[PDB]
Amino acid sequence: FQGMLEYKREDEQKLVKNLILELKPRGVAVNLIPGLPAYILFMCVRHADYLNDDQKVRSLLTSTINSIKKVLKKRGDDFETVSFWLSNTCRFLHCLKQYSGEEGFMKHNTSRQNEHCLTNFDLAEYRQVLSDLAIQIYQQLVRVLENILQPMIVSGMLEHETIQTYTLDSILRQLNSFHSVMCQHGMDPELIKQVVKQMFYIVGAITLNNLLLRKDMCSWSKGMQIRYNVSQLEEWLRDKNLMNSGAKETLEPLIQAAQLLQVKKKTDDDAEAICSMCNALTTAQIVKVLNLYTPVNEFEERVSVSFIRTIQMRLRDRKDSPQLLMDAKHIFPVTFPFNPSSLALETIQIPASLGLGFIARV
The Cα 258–Cα 262 span in angstroms is: 7
DSSP 3-state assignment of 143? helix
Of 197, 198, 258, the C-alpha closest to 229 is 258
Quote the crossing angle between the two packed helices 305-314 and 283-292, to the nearest 10°. 170
Instruction: Count CA atoms closer than 13 A to 276's CA, side-chain side.
Output: 7
The Cα 180–Cα 83 span in angstroms is: 11
Which technique was used to obtain these atomic coordinates? Answer: X-ray
The domain locations on the chain are 1-362
Of 262, 310, 255, 268, the C-alpha closest to 287 is 310
For this experimental structure, what is the resolution in angstroms? 2.5
The Cα 20–Cα 356 span in angstroms is: 12
Task: State CA 138 to chain mean position distance.
Answer: 7
Q: Helix-strand-coil percent breakdown of the chain, rounded to 5? A: 65, 0, 35
Give the number of other Cβ atoms within 10 Å of residue 82's Cβ. Answer: 25
